[PDB]
Amino acid sequence: MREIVHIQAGQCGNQIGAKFWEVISDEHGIDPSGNYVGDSDLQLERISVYYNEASSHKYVPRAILVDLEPGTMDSVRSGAFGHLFRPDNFIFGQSGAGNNWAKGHYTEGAELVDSVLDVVRKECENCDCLQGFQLTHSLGGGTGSGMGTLLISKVREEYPDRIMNTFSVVPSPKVSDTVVEPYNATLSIHQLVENTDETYCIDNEALYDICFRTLKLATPTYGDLNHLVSATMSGVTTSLRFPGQLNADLRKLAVNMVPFPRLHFFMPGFAPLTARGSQQYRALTVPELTQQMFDAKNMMAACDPRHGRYLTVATVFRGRMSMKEVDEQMLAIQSKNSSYFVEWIPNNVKVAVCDIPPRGLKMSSTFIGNSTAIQELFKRISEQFTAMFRRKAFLHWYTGEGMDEMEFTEAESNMNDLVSEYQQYQ
Amino acid sequence: MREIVHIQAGQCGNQIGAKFWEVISDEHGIDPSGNYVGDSDLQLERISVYYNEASSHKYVPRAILVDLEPGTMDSVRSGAFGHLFRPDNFIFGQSGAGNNWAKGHYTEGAELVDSVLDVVRKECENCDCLQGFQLTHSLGGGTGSGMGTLLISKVREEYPDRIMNTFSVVPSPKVSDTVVEPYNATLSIHQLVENTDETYCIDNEALYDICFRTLKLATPTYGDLNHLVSATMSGVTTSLRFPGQLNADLRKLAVNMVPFPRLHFFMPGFAPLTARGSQQYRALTVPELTQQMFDAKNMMAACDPRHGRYLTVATVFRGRMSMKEVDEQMLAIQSKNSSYFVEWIPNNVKVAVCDIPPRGLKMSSTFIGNSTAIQELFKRISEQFTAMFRRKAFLHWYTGEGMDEMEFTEAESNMNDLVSEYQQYQ
Amino acid sequence: MRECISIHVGQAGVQIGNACWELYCLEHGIQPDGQMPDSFNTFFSETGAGKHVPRAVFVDLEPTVIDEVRTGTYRQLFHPEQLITGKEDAANNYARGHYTIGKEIIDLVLDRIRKLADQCTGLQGFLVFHSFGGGTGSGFTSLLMERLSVDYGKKSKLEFSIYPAPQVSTAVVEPYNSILTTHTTLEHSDCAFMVDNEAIYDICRRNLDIERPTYTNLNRLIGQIVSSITASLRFDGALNVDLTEFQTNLVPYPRIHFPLATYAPVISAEKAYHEQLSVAEITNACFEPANQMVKCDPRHGKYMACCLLYRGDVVPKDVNAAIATIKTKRTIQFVDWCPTGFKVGINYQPPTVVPGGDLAKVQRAVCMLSNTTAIAEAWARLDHKFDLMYAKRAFVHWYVGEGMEEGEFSEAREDMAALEKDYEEVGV
Amino acid sequence: MRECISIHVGQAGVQIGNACWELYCLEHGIQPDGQMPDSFNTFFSETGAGKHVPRAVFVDLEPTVIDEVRTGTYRQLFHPEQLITGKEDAANNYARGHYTIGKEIIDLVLDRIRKLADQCTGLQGFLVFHSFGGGTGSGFTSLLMERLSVDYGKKSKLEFSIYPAPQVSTAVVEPYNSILTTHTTLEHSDCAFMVDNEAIYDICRRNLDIERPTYTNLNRLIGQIVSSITASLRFDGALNVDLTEFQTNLVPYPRIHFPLATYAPVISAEKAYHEQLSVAEITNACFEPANQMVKCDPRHGKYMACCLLYRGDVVPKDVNAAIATIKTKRTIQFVDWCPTGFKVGINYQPPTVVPGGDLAKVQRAVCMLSNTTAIAEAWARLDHKFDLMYAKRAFVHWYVGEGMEEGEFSEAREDMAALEKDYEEVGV
Ligand SMILES: Nc1nc2c(ncn2[C@@H]2O[C@H](COP(=O)(O)CP(=O)(O)OP(=O)(O)O)[C@@H](O)[C@H]2O)c(=O)[nH]1
Ligand SMILES: Nc1nc2c(ncn2[C@@H]2O[C@H](COP(=O)(O)CP(=O)(O)OP(=O)(O)O)[C@@H](O)[C@H]2O)c(=O)[nH]1
Ligand SMILES: Nc1nc2c(ncn2[C@@H]2O[C@H](COP(=O)(O)OP(=O)(O)OP(=O)(O)O)[C@@H](O)[C@H]2O)c(=O)[nH]1
Ligand SMILES: Nc1nc2c(ncn2[C@@H]2O[C@H](COP(=O)(O)OP(=O)(O)OP(=O)(O)O)[C@@H](O)[C@H]2O)c(=O)[nH]1
Ligand SMILES: [Mg+2]
Ligand SMILES: [Mg+2]
Ligand SMILES: [Mg+2]
Ligand SMILES: [Mg+2]
């Protein structure tokens, strides 16, 4: 019951996804080549959510690994824990898109799609009850942005009522690892608008900041950053994988957190973000966690929630707690500074409490916010697009792959509309 | 009771046949020169289906080995396991047909036939109850195609009510190992049309594909390819050689799978096609097997079942299973995508379940389909014939051996008729 | 059984044979005496306790060349009565080869041939080596062909003809000899494999890095082709080919049986270590005009039938893929009335290396037999050459004085014209 | 897959290649024979048991330079047929390179190129090395470019052009050659990376403390740049970059694809121990005019696109901060229509050290590819140079006599003018 398909597209997705798999396997007591080292019946009970079980009690992720560039695939396999993945779920093209969204979306993506589709169908028919999909990818590159969205579209055509989740990394203004990010982001976000139920917006800059100032680390690697993301991912789905006191699946959160179909971009935050030298000077507790979760510093999306308003917030807590305590904390948060909580939605807080905490720490919280402040992120991107598009810069590459001016205009328009909608409700 | 005669004609037949013998001997615990190393009474019980038993408990195949070219015979004997064959069952001419069907069918075949006939009569009279015949051969060459069909005709004259089976390799368009394949195929298929009860159509291209993409092998040899064929052969007749829960002999399948006398060309498929590195990531089970069997990838004939319809399908499963499970799977297959199942035949699935699985794997399936998609195979051949015949190319050789234009015309006409019939019922 | 017998006519025929037989001996572990230290049965008979002997016949209307054979490294391989010699040569006069001088020696050779046939059990065919430009290789060969037709109308007869390109011509009357003999050849040969000296020379300079090729050098390459051809008869393969097959698969029409043989890879000792020797690669090399053994204008015509004989370590799948790739290339053209153009044959023996040789040891090799319409151009040029000479009756006296009549020439010319026309027709 | 093939044209092209390939061998643990003792697959093929071979082609209309290659330390690295030579040079005459002498050798090289392509599985592109001032490096290159366009219109083609500054000119007719070739280059190149000798010399004296640089010295530095460029293709990184990426990220407009490459740090053995080698520091060095490989007037123009390729031990955060700092500096100007100017790429391999070299081992390094409007000035000066010479028809006889017409020059000039105007426009 309630079984999920994972998908990883492009470089970022593949690496983040790997990390996620490492984490969740660790949580459920699974070794890399080793079949089972779990300590508890509970872990065993819901292995079938994310895994399949071959002969002699082996276990294997319902995960699909996709990229137009062969190299990253090589890296993934070459890592320790690489033997756990079914070899038939490695589905890569021959030549990479090279940060050309159009290539991702037309020339190579189309050629790639069929194999992917077949594998997804196979995965579906294998299992009794299909819940949802989880895609990890970028909006800044050609493959993750272009092909990913195509894939999503295809999926939608097949199963209209199933859940679509995406964990999407986003562009930031000061740090651009590609000059054509405005275009790439724009095109892909349009596509997302129509086919996703919930989208988790994640910024690298924010992550870096967190690593530097909160965790007090001088040398953050990508892996470290990815760790947080992995943790967040784990947190979201804890309700499906463990018996709690109050349980909230993917669907539940979606229903709770989306007042209008269009506005389904969630800003995740996480607690507690402790440092190594600094942890022994804290009393581990509900209120502290709650206080941490609503700081602008712990928003993984680089937007200030001070300049917008929360429509809705979902709080998923792990470890034993007093539900009453949690509720009182929530109340305190709401009444004290209701300045950033929308009046027409009376109670803006959703709570889920799951009994099994992550490995390492005794109590933890994941915060998922639908904030009107997210419009700010889109605005900068829009501005950048405008700046580029007026001079027709770099349009020629996109033209060369089938694209035409009209599409760009339309996507931008859509984005603008979205922005306006967010503003209106603020 | 229920005893069979095996025959191998031409190069392909001889090699495939050898492989088959190796397999079946292995299955029933027989060593190459060694009399008996079997582990079970069951094996012993039905040795007399395929074997004879000389003094001191020796065992010998009811197999006949035929070729116009002496060389292949030499190869067969020279191989390990070559001492098991009775020396009187090696019946070869002096000079090979050289891909001239007419030579195979008139000049040398006629000279060869009498000895073969005598040996077959000897084999028949020796045994209490004669069930059927199994011929392995090609349609692309002179001996397998021409002489084989003559032999078949002769057999028919003798015993009209006995079962005729043929395992016939077929030409493919991109890969032609002879330029005169259209002619050879045409002439032999005509002959088959009138005298065979069931014909198993097998393509090399398909086999190659399977070896490359499914088994993930870089260097397929002929032996490897032949292995699959051998396995298929073994699967067909498992009902005669073992006690099951549900049993289906040669006759049973024939009755079940041929709605009209003319349409007796079966497309075999097999499961599971596992790779060496890839096997440990599968839960061995009925549903998986069923899913594998109906993929276009696992059709040994290079035709797409997506562009035709199944008239009938026979499924032979080996190893312990839940019959109920199998039936439910079948139902699922039928109702879900009935798009390629003929309406006038209500239940298009035949099931046989035999308790003894092959050596190596724990559960396995053989699929035998009567698909209207087979017309496609004939069509290309017909086209090629038309292309050649208009310019009168290579006709002269055939003329030189007694043949005349009329025969060609007639065979082609027959083929066309056959094609039409398949279409009509689609 | 399935034995095959070699006939060597004239100087060219003899010297080619010399190399070929040497190569064969090396292949089967036969020392130059005749002892070994079955498969080979198709070319060598056995008599006595351990000695093996070539089923070969050497014919020359002059003792010079065959005297060397008699007193050389391989003197003990041949019984003296399989070498026939002794007389005045057909001095580059077809007529002499055919009428005057052929008449005196024919019976002896024919008896020998019959004896050889009788020694064997159901031999498939004959391999005939000669030039077209020689008086013996032209006139005598036709006569011999006639005899063979008379005796064994059924059996296969293959030939290796040394064909002259006009730019590297060494004899004045090459055109007359070639034309007369070719007409006679037409009716009694199953197929004739043409070899051009110029092409060989080109190959030697470019791909073997030798500036100064001798005749001895050239013959080695030719011998390798022969070996490739007949290896399927002599050895165990995966997929086999015989002499009968070639006739079936190369001849759409009775008159059109003149295909070109090409060979690859042709590599110096040095170049091999910087060589990725691929199955696909060698196939590719096979269809490149610089690798042709006849200078023919290959790209202008179309291909009718193509036989690819692989030898060494080969994966059939790879071969198939290579073939597919070749088919997919646009410039290479097959006739529209044949969709499927390649006969494919495989042989487990690696090709051999000659002591003191030019050629590197290779693990994969291929010999392609290919029939193209382009070869008709060669005949056209030959005919042109003939036409001017004929116009003034140049050198006619020599022929008329040997019991050959003048209208014969005209007839031959007509026949050639008709043949040329035929190629033009079938290419549409 | 993803393989890439190097083409070396003229003297400059060859000698650069020499260094580059040497560097590559050292990097991958390839001894000068070819044995190792995968990643490298993108530049080296394999054949035989253990020997590795460069996917490289060397072209020169004269044997001199390539003869040294044939008989040197790396004689055994190349198969002899990847080196094409033998003839009269285009005596600093574009026309000869393009018309008279280019015509005779083109087919051979093209065949080789095709073969190389066929050996590989889906290679991304070509790296073309040459000078603009040489008759071969100018005229022949254009012809070759044309051929490549014809064959593989899709694929990427990058070049390394040795560009002449007027003060360090070694050839009289450098202006004509540069202009003619540049026009031809324009339509068929994806991007051309300009290198100035003078700048290199300057770098050598100031930052390597060498008063007397040889050509050999200069080439090492250039090779390092190349290595930096292609390291992402050959190795595992944290964030990667390919040839396709460069085209995407450096070219706002079809015609404007002439960016400058800079490199740092460039340090003598001695200076390193008194050096705090920072990520920020090297970035800073990267935008200082004394570190430019083309003398261009960088501060006067604006930057359009900038790619920073780091290699060695790097913290991405630090890089980001450095970038931010750079952005914040006022004097460095980006075009107003591009807010975000840097493509960033990271590579886990420390750059290598050449035995007997000038360069210190460093743990962090960077190669910046940067497109500035300032480079237009170079063209303006070249055009000025051309204009006076043209005025008197100086040296025109040599060109006209080689099958080049006079209006062609005019056309070229016009094109150059238009290009110049374009740069002026896009900078607004
Ligand atoms: N959170 C993370 N973000 C990353 C990581 N690596 C790259 N990125 C971000 O992703 C952006 C580009 O994504 P990719 O590297 O996957 C390039 P993509 O595969 O989407 O398309 P191509 O460039 O055509 O291959 C880049 O601008 C970075 O901001 C990572 O490990 N973690
Ligand atoms: N499935 C297999 N097919 C084969 C094998 N060997 C050959 N063939 C196919 O069979 C075709 C020709 O069959 P044969 O080799 O037996 C020639 P045949 O004996 O039938 O007549 P002749 O050519 O006159 O000897 C050929 O075109 C191939 O496509 C094999 O080992 N397995
Ligand atoms: N390939 C090859 N061709 C040869 C060789 N020797 C001679 N030829 C060719 O054969 C022709 C000359 O005729 P020969 O073969 O000597 O003819 P013949 O049958 O001995 O008769 P005569 O020439 O009259 O002595 C010329 O076209 C030569 O190019 C050889 O060793 N190899
Ligand atoms: N960076 C660098 N530049 C070189 C080198 N050798 C020559 N040059 C430059 O190349 C130009 C001369 O052209 P070459 O490369 O010799 O041209 P080519 O293609 O060999 O044709 P020719 O000069 O006519 O022999 C001048 O501008 C030189 O400064 C070298 O080793 N390194
Ligand atoms: Mg990528
Ligand atoms: Mg055969
Ligand atoms: Mg002579
Ligand atoms: Mg030079």
DSSP state letters, D66-77: HHHHHTSTTTTT
DSSP D313-369: S--HHHHHHHHHHHHH-SSS-B-TT-S--EEEEEESSPPP--TT-SSPP-SEEEEEE
* Distance, CA of B290 to CA of B330 (rounded, Å): 8
Q: Which residues of D377-409 are buried (b: 16+ CB within 10 A; e: fewer)?
A: bbbeebbebbeeebeeeeeeebbeebebeeeeb
* Distance, CA of B48 to CA of B59 (rounded, Å): 9
Backbone φ and ψ for A281, nearest 5 degrees, come out as: -105, 55
Per DSSP, B56 falls in state: G
Token pair for D37:
């003792």
* Distance, CA of B353 to CA of B348 (rounded, Å): 17
Sequence letter at residue C219:
N
The CATH number of the domain where D385 resides is what?
Answer: 1.10.287.600
DSSP D171-221: -TTHHHHHHHHHHHHHHH-SEEEEEEHHHHHHHHHHHH--SS--HHHHHHH
Whether the ω angle into residue A160 lies within 30 degrees of 0, i.e. cis, is no
Q: Are strands D303-312 and D364-372 parallel, antiparallel or unpaired?
A: antiparallel
Whether the ω angle into residue A272 lies within 30 degrees of 0, i.e. cis, is yes
Token pair for D138:
């100018």
Token pair for C365:
């090799």
* Distance, CA of C378 to CA of C420 (rounded, Å): 10
Question: Cβ neighbours of residue B277 under 8 Å, at least 6 residues apart?
Answer: A87, B216
* Distance, CA of C353 to CA of D176 (rounded, Å): 56
Do C235 and C334 belong together in one domain?
no
Do D43 and D184 belong together in one domain?
yes
Q: Which residues of C120-159 are buried (b: 16+ CB within 10 A; e: fewer)?
A: beebbbbbbbbbbbbbbbbbbbbbbbebbeeebeebbbbb
Backbone φ and ψ for A98, nearest 5 degrees, come out as: 60, 50
What is the Cα B189 distance to its own chain's centre?
14
Do D233 and D332 belong together in one domain?
no
* Distance, CA of B120 to CA of B111 (rounded, Å): 16
Chains that touch A (3 or more CB pairs under 8 A): B, D
Question: Cβ neighbours of residue C188 under 8 Å, at least 6 residues apart?
Answer: C145, C146, C148, C149, C157
Using what technique was this structure determined? cryo-EM
The CATH number of the domain where C293 resides is what?
Answer: 3.30.1330.20
A contact test, residue of B276, B280, B337 with most A CBs within 10 A: B280
Distance in angstroms between the alpha carbons of the first and the last residue of chain D: 42
Contacts of C249 in chain B (CB under 8 A): 99, 178-180
Q: Which residues of A89-103 are buried (b: 16+ CB within 10 A; e: fewer)?
A: bbbbbebbbbbbbbb
Domain that holds residue C338: 260-374
* Distance, CA of B262 to CA of C253 (rounded, Å): 36
Beta strands in C190-337 (DSSP E): 191-196, 260-264, 303-312
CB A195 within 8 A of CB A153: yes
* Distance, CA of B331 to CA of C262 (rounded, Å): 59
B387: helix, coil or strand?
helix
Per DSSP, A372 falls in state: T
Ligand 3 pocket member C90 (CB < 6 A): yes
Cα of D10 to ligand 4 centre, how many Å? 7
State the CB neighbour count (10 A cutoff) for residue D24: 22
Do C379 and C366 belong together in one domain?
no
Instruction: Using CB atoms within 10 Å of the CB of residue A358, give its burial: 0 to 12 exposed, 13 to 18 middle, 19+ buried.
Output: middle
Per DSSP, D152 falls in state: -
* Distance, CA of B35 to CA of B32 (rounded, Å): 8
Q: A392 — alpha (psi -120 to 50), left (phi > 0) or beta?
A: left
CB D266 within 8 A of CB D202: no
DSSP C137-163: IIIIHHHHHHHHHHH-SSSEEEEEEEE
Q: Which of C203, C237, C259 is the last residue of a domain?
A: C259
B127: helix, coil or strand?
coil
Instruction: Using CB atoms within 10 Å of the CB of residue B185, give its burial: 0 to 12 exposed, 13 to 18 middle, 19+ buried.
Output: buried
DSSP B171-228: --SS--S-TTHHHHHHHHHHHHHHH-SEEEEEEHHHHHHIIIIIS--S---HHHHHHH
Q: Which residue reads 């093929």 in tokens? A: D45
Residue among D404, D349, D366, D338 nearest D138 (CA): D404
Count of all residues that appear for chain B in the document? 426
**What number of CA atoms fall less than 13 Å from residue C287's CA on the CB side?**
24
Do D249 and D169 belong together in one domain?
yes
CB B351 within 8 A of CB B317: yes
B357: helix, coil or strand?
coil
Distance in angstroms between the alpha carbons of the first and the last residue of chain C: 42
CA dihedral A276, A278, A279, A284 (to 10 degrees): -150
Whether the ω angle into residue B272 lies within 30 degrees of 0, i.e. cis, is yes
Task: Describe chain C by its helix, strand, coil percentages, rounded to 5.
Answer: 50, 15, 35
Residue among C95, C176, C183 nearest C140 (CA): C95
CA angle C155, C156, C157 (to 5 degrees): 120
Instruction: Using CB atoms within 10 Å of the CB of residue D334, give its burial: 0 to 12 exposed, 13 to 18 middle, 19+ buried.
Output: middle
Q: Are strands B198-203 and B265-271 parallel, antiparallel or unpaired?
A: parallel
Q: Whose CA is nearest to atom 22 of ligand 4?
A: D134
C333: helix, coil or strand?
coil
CB C200 within 8 A of CB C221: yes
CB B345 within 8 A of CB B312: yes
Per DSSP, D165 falls in state: P
* Distance, CA of C317 to CA of D36 (rounded, Å): 31
Token pair for D52:
């590795």
Do D55 and D175 belong together in one domain?
yes
Do C178 and C321 belong together in one domain?
no
Pairwise CB contact (< 8 Å): A180 & D338:
no
Q: Order of strands across the sheet with D56-59?
A: D83-84, D56-59, D4-9, D125-131, D156-163, D191-196, D260-264, D364-372, D303-312, D342-347
Question: Cβ neighbours of residue C151 under 8 Å, at least 6 residues apart?
Answer: C110, C113, C114
CB C24 within 8 A of CB C74: no
Token pair for A191:
């596509």
Do D58 and D97 belong together in one domain?
yes
- Please indicate if the annotation marks D31 as binding a ligand: no
Alpha helices in D28-135 (DSSP H): 64-70, 94-95, 102-119, 135
Residue C230 forms beta bridges with which residues? none
Minimal Cβ distance to D118: which of C272, C275, C284: C284
C173: helix, coil or strand?
coil
Token pair for D351:
């750059």
* Distance, CA of D232 to CA of D124 (rounded, Å): 13
* D239, D308, D320, best to mutate for ligand 1 pocket (most atoms within 8 Å of CB): D239
Minimal Cβ distance to B280: which of A58, A88, A122: A58
Which residue numbers of C belong to the known binding site?
11, 62, 131, 135-136, 170, 197, 219
* C321 at D interface, C-beta within 8 A: no
Q: Which helix (H) or strand (E) holds D168?
A: none
Backbone φ and ψ for A245, nearest 5 degrees, come out as: -95, -35
Q: For the packed helices C215-234 and C197-208, what is the interaxial angle rounded to 10 degrees?
A: 90
Task: Describe chain B by its helix, strand, coil percentages, rounded to 5.
Answer: 50, 20, 30
CB A54 within 8 A of CB B283: yes
D89: helix, coil or strand?
coil
Backbone φ and ψ for C24, nearest 5 degrees, come out as: -60, -45
* Distance, CA of A100 to CA of A192 (rounded, Å): 18
Pairwise CB contact (< 8 Å): B391 & C254:
no
Per DSSP, A88 falls in state: G
Backbone φ and ψ for C361, nearest 5 degrees, come out as: -65, 130
Do D162 and D200 belong together in one domain?
yes
* Distance, CA of A211 to CA of A226 (rounded, Å): 11
Cα of B84 to ligand 2 centre, how many Å? 24
Q: Which residue reads 């680089």 in tokens? A: A302
Backbone φ and ψ for A305, nearest 5 degrees, come out as: -65, -10
Do C45 and C191 belong together in one domain?
yes
Pairwise CB contact (< 8 Å): C339 & B96:
no
* Distance, CA of C352 to CA of C258 (rounded, Å): 27
Range 220-249 of C in CB contact (< 8 A) with B = 236, 238-240, 242, 244-245, 247-249
Question: Cβ neighbours of residue A272 under 8 Å, at least 6 residues apart?
Answer: A282, A284, A288, A289, A292, A361, A364, A365
Cα of D125 to ligand 1 centre, how many Å? 23
* Distance, CA of D158 to CA of D224 (rounded, Å): 16
Q: Which of D374, D397, D420 is the last residue of a domain?
A: D374
Do D237 and D267 belong together in one domain?
no
Largest Cα separation within chain D, whole Å, is 62
Token pair for D241:
């970059």
Enumerate residues with CB within 5 Å of ligand 8 (an ion). Answer: D 11
Whole-angstrom CA distances from A328 to A290, A333, A339 are: 11, 9, 18
Q: Dihedral of CA D369/D374/D378/D380: which sign? A: positive
B337: helix, coil or strand?
coil
Do C275 and C320 belong together in one domain?
yes
Q: C306 — alpha (psi -120 to 50), left (phi > 0) or beta?
A: beta
CB D350 within 8 A of CB D228: no
Task: Describe chain D by its helix, strand, coil percentages, rounded to 5.
Answer: 50, 15, 35
* Distance, CA of A224 to CA of A19 (rounded, Å): 10
Q: Are strands A163-170 and A130-138 parallel, antiparallel or unpaired?
A: parallel
* Distance, CA of C159 to CA of C188 (rounded, Å): 11
Minimal Cβ distance to D45: which of C273, C276, C284: C276
* Distance, CA of B371 to CA of B299 (rounded, Å): 11
* Distance, CA of A31 to CA of B207 (rounded, Å): 37
Token pair for D39:
């990643």
A375: helix, coil or strand?
helix
* Distance, CA of D347 to CA of C385 (rounded, Å): 70
Residue among A416, A419, A338, A417 nearest A372 (CA): A419
C115: helix, coil or strand?
helix
- Domains of chain D: total: 3
Go through the domains of chain B in sequence order and give each one's CATH number.
1-259 (3.40.50.1440), 260-373 (3.30.1330.20), 374-426 (1.10.287.600)
- Please indicate if the annotation marks D135 as binding a ligand: yes
Whole-angstrom CA distances from B177 to A120, C309, C327, D151 are: 39, 11, 14, 32
State the CB neighbour count (10 A cutoff) for residue B88: 10
D33: helix, coil or strand?
coil
- Touching pair A, D by Cβ (3+ pairs < 8 Å): yes
C366: helix, coil or strand?
strand
* Distance, CA of C293 to CA of C258 (rounded, Å): 13
* Distance, CA of D335 to CA of D341 (rounded, Å): 9
Instruction: Using CB atoms within 10 Å of the CB of residue B218, give its burial: 0 to 12 exposed, 13 to 18 middle, 19+ buried.
Output: exposed
The CATH number of the domain where C26 resides is what?
Answer: 3.40.50.1440
Q: Which helix (H) or strand (E) holds B4?
A: strand B3-9
Token pair for D182:
């540049």
Token pair for D124:
């991304």
Residue among D362, D360, D326 nearest D342 (CA): D326
Whether the ω angle into residue C265 lies within 30 degrees of 0, i.e. cis, is yes
Task: Describe chain A by its helix, strand, coil percentages, rounded to 5.
Answer: 50, 20, 30
**What number of CA atoms fall less than 13 Å from residue C187's CA on the CB side?**
16
Q: Which of D338, D353, D374 is the last residue of a domain?
A: D374
* B280 at A interface, C-beta within 8 A: yes
